[PDB]
Structure formats: structure tokens, C-alpha cells
UniProtKB/Swiss-Prot annotation:
GO terms for molecular function: serine-type D-Ala-D-Ala carboxypeptidase activity. The keyword Transmembrane helix does not apply. It comes from Actinomadura sp. (strain R39). The keyword Membrane does not apply. This is D-alanyl-D-alanine carboxypeptidase. NCBIfam families: PBP4. Keywords: Antibiotic resistance, Carboxypeptidase, Cell shape, Cell wall biogenesis/degradation, Hydrolase, Peptidoglycan synthesis, Protease, Secreted, Signal. Its EC number is 3.4.16.4. The active site is at residues 49, 52, 298. GO terms for cellular component: extracellular region. It is an enzyme of class 3 (hydrolase). Inhibited by benzylpenicillin, cephaloridine, ampicillin and cetiofur. Belongs to the peptidase S13 family.
Amino acid sequence: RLTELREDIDAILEDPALEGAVSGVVVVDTATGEELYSRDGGEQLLPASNMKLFTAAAALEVLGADHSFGTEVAAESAPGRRGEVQDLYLVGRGDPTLSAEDLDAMAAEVAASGVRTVRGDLYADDTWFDSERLVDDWWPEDEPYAYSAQISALTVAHGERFDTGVTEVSVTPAAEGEPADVDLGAAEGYAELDNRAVTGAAGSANTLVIDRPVGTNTIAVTGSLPADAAPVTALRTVDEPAALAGHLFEEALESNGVTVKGDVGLGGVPADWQDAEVLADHTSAELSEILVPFMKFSNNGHAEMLVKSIGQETAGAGTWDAGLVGVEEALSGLGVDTAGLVLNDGSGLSRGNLVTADTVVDLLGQAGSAPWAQTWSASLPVAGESDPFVGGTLANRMRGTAAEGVVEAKTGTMSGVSALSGYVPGPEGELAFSIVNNGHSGPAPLAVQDAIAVRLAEYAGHQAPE
Ligand SMILES: [Mg+2]
Ligand SMILES: [Mg+2]
Ligand SMILES: [Mg+2]
């Protein structure tokens, strides 16, 4: 039975899509420790978003499943008879799920505290983390796109998936020959608009492009949107997420009847403030709950903020250098052998990351016996599940196979890198597997990955739902 499995996986790995590729493929029975399959398990390879497995485990170790994140509003003293304050600070301590609505609610609280006039300036304080926005080896051509959002302790998260440091751009066709309409979303009045896009003839070709040119806070729209085309909506990153948070808060205060006389900018609560008066605050959901949108949808921003939050907890340092050492030490303390690990970020976006399939499987086993095992597993994509908050990045994979509803695994794909690692429950055992592919030059080998996970589900004793 074991020999059949090995031959079938051998055969799957002979696929032409893996031409020139190196593939770490390890399968283990977690009840015994029996190595069911091992090929190039000690080989160092880029994990892409499989890196988040390491990040999430360390976050749960260091911060705890019950950890929550805070945001506050502070003035030098409370408002008095006149209901006045001078300068005002919006202070973020790394909430990756802070919404525009959360800002309105804090603005309401400011007003309820007796503030009627902010006489001075409004500052956005993101000093809980450093101001290093992007990892060294991240590619600047990726910068406009949501997965490459700048990292800040104070950032507005968009939508139910909580994509941080972005605005939603909507482009709507007008009459043929007239410029297309561009709505910048939350960044209206913050980001600059360079709209060069025109409306094309009905039935013409859609060539619309939405950019943020490198080193600018300009949304540049070019090309042609057909008069009969549906509006085009895209998430685009902004420069300095905290300053957008400041702009949005300004508008919320005004909206809530608080007049702001001064300017909006970046700044930290002054050292010489004797006893800051906290006029409003907000507390995020607990980490266990945050893990779900983080891991199901592979949120890069969440991982990096969690890394800087680890640095804060272990060292009082909201930085990648401290956070990344914190991840390694946490993993060691969990029992994971971290010899093959090279940590350059938390998300896996960095091409400077290295793992081995043996290390991933090692982690999968150690996480399984950790007190937080259940919140950890609930965060992972479940193969072929149609509800996006359940299926995640596996929503449209392995449907109508034995893996559907059973395989829990994390994905990770970029140019020349693809990975799938997780668990296979069954009337036999809860198998743990890692598949890491590097070096292929066509599409990512997702079908090869699916084929292994399905064979494993079958080996485990499962059948396709019909
Ligand atoms: Mg706090
Ligand atoms: Mg606005
Ligand atoms: Mg099944």
C-alpha cells in the first residue's frame, strides 16, 4: 500500500511542467512520525507565501491567540469649558484590521469627550514601528499593488479581507471621446490624480491601466475604456499609509462636528507631553480571529505587521531585524530545527527567503501539538470550499476530488516558485506534507500539487464528494 503511493507520487513528479525545476516533497504520518515520502527534503528553496506558516506560528507563540491591537487619540490635556484642544495625535500600535468605520467611531468619541475644536494640527503617529516601509529586496515594479503595500503601525484596512495601505480606484466609462471618470476612493484629497484615460467606442478594446509611478503618491490612469464596458475597480497602494489614516480621521472629525483648524501630517506624541489625555480608542479582534483573513487570503501586510509586533513584544523594537530574530527563536522554542531557514520577511514576498520541505513538515508537526493547534488549523485554506472565508486561496482547487473539504493547506506562488503544505486527515492518519517547487519556467505546477494532495487524501481513506 505504501509502495503503491510512492510510485504514484514518483509518477506525478515526472510531469513536463516541472522541467528544469527542483522540488522538495515530503510526506509524514503525524501519529507515528513515519516518513511516507521524502525527496530533496533537505534542499533549500524559496517558499513564497509558505513563509506565512512560520510567521503565524511564531505570532501565536510570542503574542498569543488572545492578543489584540490598540489605536488611540491623544491631546496634551482634556478639553475644558470652551471644548478646545491644540494639537491632536492619532496613535496606531499595529492593528492590521483598523477600518474607516473604526476611525468614524473614534471621531464620535472625541466629540463625546467634549472636543468641539482642534485648534492646532492633527498628527498621525505610527512610531510604534520603524519607518522602513518596504523590505530591501522587494521589487519596485510591484509597489502599486495591494500585496506590496507599505508597512506602518498605523494603517487603514479596506474591506472584509482587511487589505491595508490601499485605496479602491473606480474607473467608469462616459460618452465615447470623453475622459473616463476616475474615483480614487479613500485617497480622494490625499493621492494625486493623473487621469489620461479616454472612453473608447462601444465594442472597442479595453486597454485601461491604473498605476502609481514609483516614488510618487500619484494614481496615473492611461488607456481606453469602451463606452459599453463595466466600470473597472482596482486596489492601489498609497505612499505613507499613516498619512492617509490622518486624512481620513480629519474628515471623520469634521463629519462628527469637530472642526480642525490646522494641518494633517506625520508626527509622534512629543516627549515633553506630561500626561497625554486619551480622548478615544479602539481594540481589534483577537489574533485567533485575525489569523483567518490573514492565512485564508495570504495577506502580505498582515504578516509584516505581525513580524514588527513580534519585535515589539520581544525587544521593544518594531523592526524586521528584531521581529525576524523573534520568529526564529519562537520556532526553536517550539521544537523546530531552524538550520535550513533563512528569514528575510514574514510574508514570503522576498526572494531572500529560504526553507526546506523537512523544516515545513517539522513545523506542521510541532504546530499540531501546540496548545493553539486549533486556531492555527482553522486559519488554513480548506481545499475546494466555495465560501471564500473557508476555501481561501484553495476555493477553486481540488473540487469534486477526495481532497475537497479535507485537505488544509497553505499556498504560495510567484515567478518560478510554487508551494503547497499542510494536513490530510483520514480514517487512516492526519498526514502532514510539504511540496515546494522552484525553477519551473511555465505556469506554476498547481495541478501537480493538486494531484499529490488528492492521492494523499485517497491514501488517507477519503473519496470525492458526489
Ligand atoms: Mg496596545
Ligand atoms: Mg478622502
Ligand atoms: Mg473527501
